[PDB]
Amino acid sequence: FLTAVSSIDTFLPVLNEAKLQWPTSALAASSEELLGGYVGSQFYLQDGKYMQFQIAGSSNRCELRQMIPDGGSEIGWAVDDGTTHTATSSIVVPEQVDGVEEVTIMQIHSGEAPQLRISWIRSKSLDGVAYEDFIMSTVRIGTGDSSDNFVKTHLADRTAGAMSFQIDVKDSKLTITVNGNVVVNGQDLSFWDGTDSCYFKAGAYNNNPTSESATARIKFAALAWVDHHHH
User: Which of 37, 68, 82, 202 is spaced 20 to 30 Å from 19 by Cα?
Assistant: First the structure.
């Protein structure tokens, strides 16, 4: 039988501040249900240690969505509200099966668009350099579809072992730290000033697969939204 993520202590803080969306943006489990042992093949505890997300199908997802703690409603914050917004994680990205091409593993999202996606990607060229099997950041600096709306950055080659991520947003600037090294230092997010519906997500969101049957799989060793106000 599948073991529930809430059966150990590691992920209780974040489960108290999230809801699960699966297999689309539809609610699959409230915070209370996650703390109460919600479990399925899409979301279970692997190796007694990892919060494992699994999803197949183009644009489908199995993702935690940040919520107000202790049974609260949807959170929304702004990049320019003056507070530091921080997410941390430690992620094992296994070798992905054939047909999986890109998996988004953390996001900053608003009602209508992703400000930031961190994704694993099988193969891509960036700025005239071909990269394989790597982690990338995609930042939106507009809502359009042309390449001037995006800032895309190679963060790191995928490792077999856990990779740690920290995302900080403060005063309309984004910092991304990977394995303790600042890789994205003060990216401008001021396009989004005034949008007060932003929130963190994490999990697996499957992008442009070549088979809708192929299951993406991501293992989290740690995940938290870090509150700088301690309220």
Answer: 82
